[PDB]
Amino acid sequence: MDDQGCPRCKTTKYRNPSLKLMVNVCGHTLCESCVDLLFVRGAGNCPECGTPLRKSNFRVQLFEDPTVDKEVEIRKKVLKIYNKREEDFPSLREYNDFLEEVEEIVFNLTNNVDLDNTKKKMEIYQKENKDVIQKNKLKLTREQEELEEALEVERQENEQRRLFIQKEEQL
Amino acid sequence: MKLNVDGLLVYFPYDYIYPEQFSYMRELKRTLDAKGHGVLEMPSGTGKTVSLLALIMAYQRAYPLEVTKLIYCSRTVPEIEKVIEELRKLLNFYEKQEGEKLPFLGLALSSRKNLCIHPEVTPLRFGKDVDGKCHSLTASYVRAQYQHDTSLPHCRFYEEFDAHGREVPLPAGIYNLDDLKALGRRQGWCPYFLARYSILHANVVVYSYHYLLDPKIADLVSKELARKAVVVFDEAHNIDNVCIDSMSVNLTRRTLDRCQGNLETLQKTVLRIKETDEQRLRDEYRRLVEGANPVLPDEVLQEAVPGSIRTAEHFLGFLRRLLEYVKWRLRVQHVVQESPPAFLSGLAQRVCIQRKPLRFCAERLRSLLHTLEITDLADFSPLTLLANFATLVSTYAKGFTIIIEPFDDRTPTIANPILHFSCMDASLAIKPVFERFQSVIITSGTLSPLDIYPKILDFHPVTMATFTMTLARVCLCPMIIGRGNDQVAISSKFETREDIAVIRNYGNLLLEMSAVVPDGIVAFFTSYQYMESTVASWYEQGILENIQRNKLLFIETQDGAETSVALEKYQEACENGRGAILLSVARGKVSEGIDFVHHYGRAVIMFGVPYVYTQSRILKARLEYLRDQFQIRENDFLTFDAMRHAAQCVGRAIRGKTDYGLMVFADKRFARGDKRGKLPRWIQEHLTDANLNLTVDEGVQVAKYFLRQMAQPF
Numbered sequence: 057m058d059d060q061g062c063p064r065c066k067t068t069k070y071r072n073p074s075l076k077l078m079v080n081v082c083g084h085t086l087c088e089s090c091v092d093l094l095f096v097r098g099a100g101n102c103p104e105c106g107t108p109l110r111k112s113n114f115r116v117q118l119f120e121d122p123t124v125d126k127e128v129e130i131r132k133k134v135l136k137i138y139n140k141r142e143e144d145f146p147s148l149r150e151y152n153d154f155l156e157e158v159e160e161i162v163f164n165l166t167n168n169v170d171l172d173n174t175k176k177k178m179e180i181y182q183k184e185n186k187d188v189i190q191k192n193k194l195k196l197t198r199e200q201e202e203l204e205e206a207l208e209v210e211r212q213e214n215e216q217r218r219l220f221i222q223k224e225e226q227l
Numbered sequence: 228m229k230l231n232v233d234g235l236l237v238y239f240p241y242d243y244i245y246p247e248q249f250s251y252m253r254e255l256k257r258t259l260d261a262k263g264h265g266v267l268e269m270p271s272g273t274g275k276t277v278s279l280l281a282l283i284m285a286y287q288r289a290y291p292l293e294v295t296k297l298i299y300c301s302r303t304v305p306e307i308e309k310v311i312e313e314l315r316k317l318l319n320f321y322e323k324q325e326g327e328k329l330p331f332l333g334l335a336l337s338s339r340k341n342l343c344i345h346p347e348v349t350p351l352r353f354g355k356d357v358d359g360k361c362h363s364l365t366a367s368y369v370r371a372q373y374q375h376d377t378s379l380p381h382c383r384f385y386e387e388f389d390a391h392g393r394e395v396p397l398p399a400g401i402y403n404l405d406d407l408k409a410l411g412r413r414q415g416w417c418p419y420f421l422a423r424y425s426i427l428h429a430n431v432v433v434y435s436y437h438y439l440l441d442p443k444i445a446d447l448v449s450k451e452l453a454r455k456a457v458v459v460f461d462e463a464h465n466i467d468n469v470c471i472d473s474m475s476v477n478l479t480r481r482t483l484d485r486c487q488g489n490l491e492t493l494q495k496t497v498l499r500i501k502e503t504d505e506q507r508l509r510d511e512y513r514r515l516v517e518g519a520n521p522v523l524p525d526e527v528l529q530e531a532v533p534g535s536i537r538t539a540e541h542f543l544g545f546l547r548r549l550l551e552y553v554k555w556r557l558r559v560q561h562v563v564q565e566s567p568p569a570f571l572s573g574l575a576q577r578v579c580i581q582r583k584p585l586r587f588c589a590e591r592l593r594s595l596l597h598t599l600e601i602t603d604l605a606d607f608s609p610l611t612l613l614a615n616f617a618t619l620v621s622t623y624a625k626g627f628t629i630i631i632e633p634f635d636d637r638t639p640t641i642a643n644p645i646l647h648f649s650c651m652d653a654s655l656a657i658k659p660v661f662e663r664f665q666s667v668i669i670t671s672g673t674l675s676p677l678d679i680y681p682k683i684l685d686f687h688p689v690t691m692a693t694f695t696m697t698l699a700r701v702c703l704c705p706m707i708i709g710r711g712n713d714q715v716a717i718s719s720k721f722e723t724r725e726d727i728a729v730i731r732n733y734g735n736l737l738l739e740m741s742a743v744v745p746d747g748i749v750a751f752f753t754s755y756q757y758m759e760s761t762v763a764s765w766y767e768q769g770i771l772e773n774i775q776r777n778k779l780l781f782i783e784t785q786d787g788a789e790t791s792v793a794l795e796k797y798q799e800a801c802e803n804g805r806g807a808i809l810l811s812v813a814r815g816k817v818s819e820g821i822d823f824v825h826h827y828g829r830a831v832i833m834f835g836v837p838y839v840y841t842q843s844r845i846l847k848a849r850l851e852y853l854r855d856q857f858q859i860r861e862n863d864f865l866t867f868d869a870m871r872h873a874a875q876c877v878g879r880a881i882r883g884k885t886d887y888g889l890m891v892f893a894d895k896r897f898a899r900g901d902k903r904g905k906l907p908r909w910i911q912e913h914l915t916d917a918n919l920n921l922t923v924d925e926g927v928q929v930a931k932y933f934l935r936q937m938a939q940p941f
């Protein structure tokens with residue numbers, strides 16, 4: 057919302073900040089009033105670049121920095137790969153070496169051509185999915201579930217503490 | 228004067244000691260013999276330093292192996308200067324008694340800003356600026372370039388110190404800060420680094436808390452060398468607040484914008500470095516793979532690996548992501564939100580920033596920023612603050628909390644929101660001191676009752692004794708006035724604050740007390756806004772003009788320059804027969820910094836019990852967490868915070884040399900048993916039921932009579 061305005065229609069960005077960026081394969085600071093303008097003609101084409109889009113390639117995002125928008129979306133996609141837990145590797149260096157390669161992949165995708173990254177990702181898809189990728193999908197789902205359970209346990213304990221001290225006072 | 232203490236024989240410079248001094252020395256010797264941390268209170272502002280220092284020196288002589296050295300800390304450098312003066316006098320006395328020099332060293336550490344000899348940094352007074360300039364001059368890059376001896380300003384003092392002081396340490400002696408500056412000038416060495424090295428072999432070292440509490444700078448000079456040392460904190464009743472401040476980090480919108488600009492400059496500098504010199508500075512990557520100071524204490528700090536951030540670009544992107552998350556989280560407009568662990572979890576989920584890589588953020592910032600050969604760290608200081616916050620949050624949140632304030636107090640609508648990371652318990656940050664050092668003595672004056680302190684700070688005290696000053700004459704005659712001439716309650720309650728009758732009672736009491744009291748009087752209010760409201764009411768009425776006629780009136784303001792000018796004029800007014808009435812705030816920095824002595828602040832007036840506003844959400848976390856853990860009632864802790872502050876701001880008049888003076892508290896709340904009980908023992912025992920709730924007129928009459936009694940000689 058801190059951006060000066062859209063490259064084309066920098067108006068709404070001044071009147072109100074309600075508009076949120078729209079991510080695309082192009083990687084852009086697109087705005088809803090401008091998304092309508094893209095829908096009317098082209099229907100999934102970047103105005104200046106002209107990059108084709110299958111179905112408008114539009115998804116909501118909330119950060120004034122377009123570079124952060126693209127980086128966060130690319131990282132979201134990448135996290136689906138190389139999600140194996142650290143303890144799977146006993147080697148000290150290998151704990152974060154693969155994370156280094158992951159972030160290198162992210163930076164490569166942000167600016168440089170993604171053809172090599174896609175070919176490499178196909179290679180990692182075939183070799184790792186056989187066993188480890190689906191296993192770590194399961195384990196990360198388990199840890200998400202148990203963290204939401206633990207936060208609800210914390211909030212049950214806080215509600216019980218509030219209501220029991222109230223019943224202390226009234227009793 | 229050699230005192231045959233029960234433990235041993237202890238020298239003493241002055242001729243006579245009061246029985247309270249005997250009690251202090253015996254209790255202190257008991258604590259040292261037990262070799263266990265403890266806390267004790269002594270009334271006198273001065274005299275306690277000499278007794279403590281003499282006992283510690285005698286104990287060191289008797290059992291040198293038991294205690295390696297003494298680490299005596301004081302609130303402020305102007306105060307610690309008086310301590311070094313006392314130590315110098317004691318050493319001169321002992322040296323005269325022995326007839327020869329002994330291998331004893333005593334020194335005081337202080338900031339490079341306070342003491343330094345470089346003309347370039349001399350004109351600048353801002354501490355971050357001095358730190359950055361000194362880092363630039365002493366940089367490893369500058370040292371290597373000095374080896375080349377190219378045409379460039381190089382700070383010769385550090386180089387000469389490295390050449391000479393490394394080989395030869397200072398034999399012995401006592402050096403004040405000012406005298407150490409002269410020694411550094413004469414020897415072409417650093418008064419700072421020379422003392423830093425002497426810490427390795429020094430019998431006595433003195434420096435303020437922020438040199439011994441904050442893990443960033445405290446640890447480096449408080450390394451494990453002093454495994455068994457007598458660490459002592461003087462007048463450290465406000466130790467919890469400073470220990471919390473050593474951890475709390477405040478993030479603001481302006482600071483975040485400055486961080487973003489600094490980060491842009493960092494990126495540009497990285498590009499320039501890549502195009503100019505790349506391989507030599509890339510060797511940093513190799514040493515990083517092998518594996519401003521970190522805020523993580525000894526055991527909490529970790530150095531396994533930097534993490535996923537292994538290159539300049541990767542680290543820069545990580546900081547960009549975290550800064551964007553903080554920016555948005557702060558921009559959100561809503562009620563105050565608290566989230567110690569939920570903040571970390573939400574950060575990791577929303578922006579994909581794992582806590583383990585986030586942990587080493589500040590350390591990797593220090594290393595990478597060093598690689599960049601920046602001009603100075605002053606420009607990038609906001610980024611380092613944000614990095615310290617980023618590493619701290621990922622380090623721990625069990626006894627912490629992140630508070631967000633989209634709207635600031637005293638402003639219906641302001642575009643400068645603030646994110647606080649205020650701590651809740653000081654035990655977390657003060658644990659290393661207690662654990663590392665065999666025994667710590669928290670010697671304090673005006674101490675609110677000791678029982679609370681073990682609860683707030685997790686330690687097992689050895690002795691719990693309150694020492695009462697005993698003199699042939701009643702130096703202090705405190706009183707509490709709750710009933711005015713109208714026989715109306717004068718409590719300064721929030722709902723009763725607006726009461727014009729109560730304000731009038733305060734004004735009339737001040738008028739009469741200024742009429743009778745001799746030159747020099749200080750009145751402490753509860754807040755700036757309350758003080759201004761009372762002053763305005765008195766101005767609308769004729770009371771204020773009469774007070775002005777009777778005696779000069781000075782007022783305190785938030786601005787330090789005006790505060791200093793007003794206090795400077797107040798001192799001259801006290802010296803002259805005009806007199807002065809200094810209105811100030813209990814929480815004001817002036818109240819804690821200033822010390823009142825004979826013919827200074829003769830009658831200390833306390834207008835209302837000092838209570839912090841019940842809306843500041845930081846205190847809500849700090850207080851409800853104490854209720855949940857350590858089991859302290861909210862009202863108990865609030866009244867403790869009021870009584871400790873009042874004792875701090877009212878205990879100055881009895882500084883030393885047996886200078887008479889009266890402490891009047893114009894609030895019926897102090898008459899309550901709980902307030903009296905929590906009041907320090909020495910003041911309370913002097914206080915009696917006869918004068919507990921004197922009317923305004925009766926208090927004035929008894930004050931006049933007591934001043935008559937104290938006027939005559941011994």
Ligand code: SF4
Nearest residue numbers: 343361382384385417
């Ligand atoms: S190296 Fe020594 S003399 Fe030079 S600026 Fe730093 S403290 Fe001052």
Ligand SMILES: [Zn+2]
Nearest residue numbers: 062065087089
């Ligand atoms: Zn637009």
Ligand SMILES: [Zn+2]
Nearest residue numbers: 082084102105
């Ligand atoms: Zn485009």
